[PDB]
Amino acid sequence: AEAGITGTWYNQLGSTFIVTAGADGALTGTYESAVGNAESRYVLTGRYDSAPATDGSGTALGWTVAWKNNYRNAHSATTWSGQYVGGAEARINTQWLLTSGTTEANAWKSTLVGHDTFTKV
Amino acid sequence: AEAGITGTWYNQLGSTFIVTAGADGALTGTYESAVGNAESRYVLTGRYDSAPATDGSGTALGWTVAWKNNYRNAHSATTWSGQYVGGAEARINTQWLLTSGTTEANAWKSTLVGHDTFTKV
Amino acid sequence: AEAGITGTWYNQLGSTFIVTAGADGALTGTYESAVGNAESRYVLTGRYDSAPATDGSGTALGWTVAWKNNYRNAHSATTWSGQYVGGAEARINTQWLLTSGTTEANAWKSTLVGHDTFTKV
Amino acid sequence: AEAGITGTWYNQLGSTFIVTAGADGALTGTYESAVGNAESRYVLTGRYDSAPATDGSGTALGWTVAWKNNYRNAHSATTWSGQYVGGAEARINTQWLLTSGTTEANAWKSTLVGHDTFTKV
């Protein structure tokens, strides 16, 4: 993990994220999207749980992106929860939650759920 | 938001989190849980999307907690996605995803989903 | 379960559902909503997993409602997954997924997630 | 939809489901799994929202499977929410919620979330 997580990742929809996995569980970087009310690079911050593993499991991690930068303010944020699997074809499999700020009446419809798989290629 | 988010929040299960909402969308603090393979305080990091609002909507935000500290290493991480609503009875309504590192065979059962509401009281 | 599930249930938003839990795991009834692109009663169908329990656990169950009836066709369907807990204050705690038919380009934003608690009162 | 939904579907993990989409929104059939505390065929019931479409969108639908049959009683149920897209490579893209009956103390960890894509091949 850590060294293996650090780098550029791409998902099926064309988004890209560059992350640095720091020694004490931190994940920092930028996300450049391909879809949504997004436009350019947004800051991302997260954490990963580093473990000695002896059975080939993935490294659990998660990060958040608030969709606001100097060109767009979508009033929403997305969090990705998943795990990193390294190797030949290292990947990060995730499920995400995208919440939009709504009025109380519409809060019941404020969150979308989806999944994304990121690869190094 | 920001000033209103900064502070101590409590949820229905007895967990507590203290956060500082920084001027440029950052959320940093600690989470002390009440349930799970948790024990003590864990670092939390996230982002919030600050907007001029003129219709009473909530502020979208999200944060991550990797469940590893000096006393526990649960090999998992949780991400909360939701929005802050301020006022008399300010609250943060969220939905969360908890992913555990698993082997490929068990990846299909690696993520739990739930929701939490935090209040200042 | 079964006998205890059969009846009228109400949730926090004002929706109501009447169900009959049949001897072999079937759930049939109608859902009358309070929110959404809904208007009147819709047919609901589902299943519940009946078990001999000796430790007070809930009965897992799930149902689906396609939001189409003689007055509305919202092009969407919602599924509720949860469990029934009986007793003095019997309740059905659920998490739901609402999917809308979209074009391929928008499929990534086709599903909303939420939770509902139903009571007999 | 309807005629196009009726038939045998397969997902990436080796599970199979045979469904009949009836004229008035009903979905009935059997699910034979490949993973979990499953073993053989289980009854499935659901609904789909049939619409006149003029822009190539998918048909929203959902179904439930209680994991109990004559050989297994897993005390759990899964609901799939998604949409059918027809054509050359017709598919049903879904997100699912699997809830297990738990005690109140463990209800917070009773639901798993995932996604599955089914094809006719």
From Swiss-Prot, chains A, B, C, D:
One of its GO terms (cellular component) is extracellular region. The biological function of streptavidin is not known. Forms a strong non-covalent specific complex with biotin (one molecule of biotin per subunit of streptavidin). It comes from Streptomyces avidinii. The keyword Transferase does not apply. Homotetramer. One of its GO terms (molecular function) is biotin binding. Keywords: Biotin, Secreted, Signal. Residues 1-121 form the Avidin-like domain. This is Streptavidin. A motif (Cell attachment site) lies at residues 47-49. It is found in: Secreted. Belongs to the avidin/streptavidin family. The chain holds residues 37 to 157 of 183 of the full protein. Biotin binds at residues 31, 42, 80, 96, 108. It comes from the Bacteria.
